[PDB]
Amino acid sequence: GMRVYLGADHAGYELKQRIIEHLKQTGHEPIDCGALRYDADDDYPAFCIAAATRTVADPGSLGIVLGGSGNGEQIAANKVPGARCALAWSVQTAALAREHNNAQLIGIGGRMHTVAEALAIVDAFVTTPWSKAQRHQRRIDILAEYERTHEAPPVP
Amino acid sequence: GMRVYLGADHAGYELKQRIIEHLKQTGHEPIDCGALRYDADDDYPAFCIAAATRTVADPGSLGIVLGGSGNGEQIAANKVPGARCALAWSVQTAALAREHNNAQLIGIGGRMHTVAEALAIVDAFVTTPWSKAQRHQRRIDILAEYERTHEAPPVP
Numbered sequence: 482g483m484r485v486y487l488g489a490d491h492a493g494y495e496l497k498q499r500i501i502e503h504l505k506q507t508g509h510e511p512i513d514c515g516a517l518r519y520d521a522d523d524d525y526p527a528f529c530i531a532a533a534t535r536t537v538a539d540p541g542s543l544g545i546v547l548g549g550s551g552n553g554e555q556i557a558a559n560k561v562p563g564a565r566c567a568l569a570w571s572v573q574t575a576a577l578a579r580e581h582n583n584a585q586l587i588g589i590g591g592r593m594h595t596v597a598e599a600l601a602i603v604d605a606f607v608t609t610p611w612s613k614a615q616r617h618q619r620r621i622d623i624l625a626e627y628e629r630t631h632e633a634p635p636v637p
Numbered sequence: 638g639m640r641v642y643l644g645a646d647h648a649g650y651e652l653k654q655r656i657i658e659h660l661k662q663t664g665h666e667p668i669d670c671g672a673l674r675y676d677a678d679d680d681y682p683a684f685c686i687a688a689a690t691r692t693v694a695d696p697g698s699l700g701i702v703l704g705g706s707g708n709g710e711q712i713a714a715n716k717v718p719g720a721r722c723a724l725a726w727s728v729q730t731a732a733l734a735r736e737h738n739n740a741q742l743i744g745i746g747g748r749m750h751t752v753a754e755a756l757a758i759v760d761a762f763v764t765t766p767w768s769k770a771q772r773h774q775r776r777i778d779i780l781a782e783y784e785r786t787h788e789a790p791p792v793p
């Protein structure tokens with residue numbers, strides 16, 4: 482049972498609403514950050530920053546942000562302090578985003594998948610645990626430290 | 638043109654060396670930020686932050702960051718102020734990254750493609766122009782302002 486914050490522009494709006502329904506059906510708690518209706522001209526950043534900000538502030542939660550490709554949306558979510566947003570374009574990448582990257586959010590492209598494919602990506606994301614493996618935590622900590630100071634760490 | 642900054646961990650290392658060779662052959666100037674050798678245990682953030690920082694600082698340059706999926710790498714690159722790093726998993730997504738998101742960088746997963754698929758992705762990325770269309774520029778500006786202030790833009 483996961484709480485999931487969702488954000489989308491117009492290009493991801495229709496898939497977002499379908500995902501919200503699916504998440505309800507499969508025992509989860511979706512929270513819609515908008516867009517709340519289709520608006521052809523609307524701008525992705527606000528919705529993605531909102532979902533990402535709320536996700537980071539609510540530990541244990543996850544997030545999903547949607548656009549055409551999903552890339553603008555993961556980019557915007559990733560600007561939020563503490564947020565790690567993968568682009569999920571397959572079951573495997575959704576799974577690995579959790580397992581390796583402890584990603585609290587994924588971006589999905591509404592123009593990229595069938596509904597069946599998208600929901601499969603969503604299922605993998607909400608059910609795959611974070612592995613807690615040492616090397617992954619080490620890498621996440623390194624990135625977290627860069628985010629704290631914006632001082633580029635030295636390369637080997 | 639052009640200068641292309643490459644960063645990879647061990648999981649994207651062999652693909653990175655292949656991409657560098659390909660970019661030389663296609664008339665570009667690849668710049669290797671590391672890893673310079675295969676180290677099975679190495680940590681992606683430093684290489685990706687290096688690539689992203691150098692790309693954002695170098696007008697007209699692009700950047701490519703590689704890992705297993707590419708997702709930890711685009712996340713790290715996106716923590717760099719001013720950087721927009723998409724995850725490119727196809728020719729279409731590489732092209733749209735440039736066209737819509739004006740991404741200076743893409744992440745590619747070394748575990749996700751054949752070399753031929755990966756090089757097609759690279760070609761699309763380095764040859765597809767930024768559209769300069771109004772709505773895309775507006776969205777990038779909104780994100781840049783959030784990076785500047787951390788004031789979450791209002792949701793409609």
Ligand SMILES: O=C(O)[C@H](O)[C@H](O)[C@H](O)COP(=O)(O)O
Binds near residue numbers: 490
């Ligand atoms: O993920 C994406 O494809 C992006 O961030 C936007 O959704 C896309 O540029 C919208 O394109 P539009 O509907 O404005 O043509």
Ligand SMILES: O=C(O)[C@H](O)[C@H](O)[C@H](O)COP(=O)(O)O
Binds near residue numbers: 582648681
């Ligand atoms: O792009 C990704 O797959 C990630 O950021 C790392 O490359 C991945 O977790 C490395 O996995 P490892 O080789 O340590 O199993």
